[PDB]
Design an enzyme around this catalytic site. Structure first.
Site, short mmCIF file in Angstrom:
data_model
loop_
_atom_site.label_atom_id
_atom_site.label_comp_id
_atom_site.label_asym_id
_atom_site.label_seq_id
_atom_site.Cartn_x
_atom_site.Cartn_y
_atom_site.Cartn_z
N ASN A 79 -0.76 1.17 -6.59
CA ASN A 79 -1.81 2.18 -6.64
C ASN A 79 -1.42 3.56 -7.13
OD1 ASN A 79 -4.34 1.04 -5.72
ND2 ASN A 79 -3.14 0.54 -3.88
N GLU A 119 4.12 0.41 -12.22
CA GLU A 119 3.38 -0.81 -12.44
C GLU A 119 2.22 -0.64 -13.41
OE1 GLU A 119 2.80 -2.90 -8.61
OE2 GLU A 119 4.96 -2.70 -8.45
N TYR A 191 5.94 -12.85 -6.13
CA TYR A 191 4.82 -13.10 -5.22
C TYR A 191 3.55 -12.60 -5.89
CZ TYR A 191 7.02 -8.59 -3.93
OH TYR A 191 7.61 -7.36 -3.92
N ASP A 192 2.41 -12.77 -5.23
CA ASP A 192 1.13 -12.36 -5.78
C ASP A 192 0.81 -13.23 -6.98
OD1 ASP A 192 0.83 -10.17 -4.01
OD2 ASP A 192 2.03 -8.90 -5.34
N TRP A 337 9.40 -7.54 1.01
CA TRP A 337 8.29 -6.62 1.11
C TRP A 337 7.41 -7.18 2.22
CZ3 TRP A 337 7.13 -2.08 -1.25
CH2 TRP A 337 5.87 -1.54 -0.88
C1 LIG Z 1 -1.53 -2.17 3.96
O1 LIG Z 1 -2.73 -2.44 3.22
C2 LIG Z 1 -3.64 -1.31 3.25
C3 LIG Z 1 -3.04 -0.07 2.58
O2 LIG Z 1 -2.64 -0.39 1.23
C4 LIG Z 1 -1.98 0.72 0.57
O3 LIG Z 1 -1.71 0.37 -0.78
C5 LIG Z 1 -0.60 -0.51 -0.86
C6 LIG Z 1 -0.96 -1.97 -0.47
O4 LIG Z 1 -2.06 -2.46 -1.26
C7 LIG Z 1 0.25 -2.88 -0.64
N1 LIG Z 1 -0.19 -4.28 -0.52
C8 LIG Z 1 0.43 -5.14 0.28
C9 LIG Z 1 -0.05 -6.59 0.33
O5 LIG Z 1 1.39 -4.78 0.95
C10 LIG Z 1 0.90 -2.69 -2.03
O6 LIG Z 1 2.12 -3.43 -2.04
C11 LIG Z 1 2.65 -3.65 -3.36
C12 LIG Z 1 3.48 -2.48 -3.93
O7 LIG Z 1 2.60 -1.52 -4.51
C13 LIG Z 1 4.33 -3.11 -5.04
N2 LIG Z 1 5.69 -2.58 -5.05
C14 LIG Z 1 6.55 -3.49 -4.64
N3 LIG Z 1 7.89 -3.30 -4.59
C15 LIG Z 1 8.77 -4.38 -4.12
C16 LIG Z 1 8.47 -2.00 -4.97
O8 LIG Z 1 6.00 -4.68 -4.30
C17 LIG Z 1 4.57 -4.58 -4.62
C18 LIG Z 1 3.75 -4.69 -3.33
C19 LIG Z 1 3.27 -6.11 -2.99
O9 LIG Z 1 2.25 -6.50 -3.90
O10 LIG Z 1 1.19 -1.30 -2.29
C20 LIG Z 1 -0.01 -0.47 -2.27
C21 LIG Z 1 0.37 0.97 -2.60
O11 LIG Z 1 0.97 1.00 -3.89
C22 LIG Z 1 -2.90 1.94 0.49
N4 LIG Z 1 -2.15 3.03 -0.15
C23 LIG Z 1 -2.31 3.31 -1.45
C24 LIG Z 1 -1.44 4.46 -1.99
O12 LIG Z 1 -3.11 2.73 -2.19
C25 LIG Z 1 -3.41 2.32 1.87
O13 LIG Z 1 -2.31 2.78 2.65
C26 LIG Z 1 -4.05 1.08 2.54
O14 LIG Z 1 -4.49 1.39 3.87
#
Ligand SMILES: COC[C@H]1O[C@@H](O[C@H]2[C@@H](O)[C@@H](NC(C)=O)[C@H](O[C@H]3[C@H](O)[C@H]4N=C(N(C)C)O[C@H]4[C@@H]3CO)O[C@@H]2CO)[C@H](NC(C)=O)[C@H](O)[C@@H]1O
EC number: 3.2.1.14
Length: 365
Positions: A79, A119, A191-192, A337
């Protein structure tokens, strides 16, 4: 072998037993702890929560209890977007403003390195020109890190990057061979592969394809992703195999059909703690009583359903399988993760504290 684990600074806002802060961390579970996420402001590395400096302190203070631990700050995230990255790597003075801020920022708070998570370079609004600008940003960071280490006399800052599995994304923006030479290790996000966006139930992180898959539909599995990075210039020892402590859910069109390929009316019910439909923390897939667990023989990972809720996920078994696969492949270790979504405090699965990652640590060590 490495065991790279991601801490996320928004887990702190979850309710009850789900709430996660540095104190819930185990200084010894992983070899490397990566702090997600830091943002950007004026081509400069920056915090994202009202308490990141305090967390940074607890995060890195853990090295006092375990001096062998290596911490890193991750910039980016799904995000985050590509906008700010593409703009920052656009000009010399911009790449420099960042790099210098990165160094000063990492040292300031005691981070041992920087983990890039853009990303992704070459997609999501990124010009294919960002493919090579990435390689520059990497070489630049690597170089400034090596120079800093010599002038400051400290352990050289570490450089890593989280990378996509998809053939499309890799081609679009990664000079695999050239970046692998400057990255201390590569965190593969295997994953994903399947989620609630597709219209049919599939697995988030299958190790192998099902007999029934041909073409690009095949590659949607760990092995393909791994083979792709190796076969493109990534020293196996630098390639860290990522695993998820979360699974992806679907709402079934009909509970009469619950197989791996069944029709899905959309994402699965949000989890009570994660509250984001289409995903579920491992600790949420445990509370599931009166549900049906099955294995996907071809993929070596499980999945379960209760009525019209279907969720593909990873368990202790599938983690053991995967740890064994990377070993057979000679990979540098595992990536996970996130610390966050495992049953980090044994408050749900009745398997102890960190059932999945503890599994990774034992199978790896
Ligand atoms: C916890 O869910 C609600 C929460 O999401 C926050 O955004 C994050 C989530 O969507 C993460 N999703 C999951 C399934 O954990 C997401 O995870 C991504 C990450 O962006 C990518 N980076 C990596 N690595 C290894 C560096 O791996 C990928 C993972 C897994 O797909 O990350 C997003 C944030 O980027 C919300 N926050 C934001 C900023 O959108 C918010 O906190 C919400 O409540």
């Amino acid at each position: 072998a490495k065991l790279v684990c991601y801490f996320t600074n928004w887990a702190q806002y979850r309710q009850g037993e789900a709430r996660f802060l540095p104190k819930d961390l185990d200084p010894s579970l992983c070899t490397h702890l990566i702090y997600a996420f830091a943002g950007m402001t004026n081509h400069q590395l920056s915090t994202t929560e009202w308490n990141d400096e305090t967390l940074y302190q607890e995060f890195n203070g853990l090295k006092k209890m375990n001096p062998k631990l290596k911490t890193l700050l991750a910039i980016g995230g799904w995000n985050f977007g590509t906008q700010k990255f593409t703009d920052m790597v656009a000009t010399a003075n911009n790449r420099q403003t960042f790099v210098n801020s990165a160094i000063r920022f990492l040292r300031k708070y005691s981070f041992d390195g920087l983990d890039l998570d853009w990303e992704y370079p070459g997609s999501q609004g990124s010009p294919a020109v960002d493919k090579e600008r990435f390689t520059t940003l990497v070489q630049d960071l690597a170089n400034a890190f090596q120079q800093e280490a010599q002038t400051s006399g400290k352990e050289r800052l570490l450089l890593s990057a989280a990378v996509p599995a998809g053939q499309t994304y890799v081609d679009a923006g990664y000079e695999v061979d050239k970046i692998a030479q400057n990255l201390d290790f590569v965190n593969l996000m295997a994953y994903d592969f399947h989620g609630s966006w597709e219209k049919v139930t599939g697995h988030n992180s299958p190790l192998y394809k099902r007999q029934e898959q041909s073409g690009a539909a095949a590659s949607l599995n760990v092995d393909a992703a791994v083979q792709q990075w190796l076969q493109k210039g990534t020293p196996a020892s630098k390639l860290i195999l990522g695993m998820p402590t979360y699974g992806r859910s679907f709402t079934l069109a009909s509970s009469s059909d619950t197989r791996v390929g069944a029709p899905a009316t959309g994402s699965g019910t949000p989890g009570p703690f994660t509250k984001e439909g289409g995903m579920l923390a491992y600790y949420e897939v445990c509370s599931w009583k009166g549900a049906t667990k099955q294995r996907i023989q071809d993929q070596k990972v499980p999945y379960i359903f209760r009525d019209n809720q279907w969720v593909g996920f990873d368990d202790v078994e599938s983690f053991k399988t995967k740890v064994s696969y990377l070993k057979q492949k000679g990979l540098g270790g595992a990536m996970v993760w996130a610390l966050d979504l495992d049953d980090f405090a044994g408050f749900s699965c009745n398997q102890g504290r960190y059932p999945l990652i503890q599994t990774l640590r034992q199978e790896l060590s």
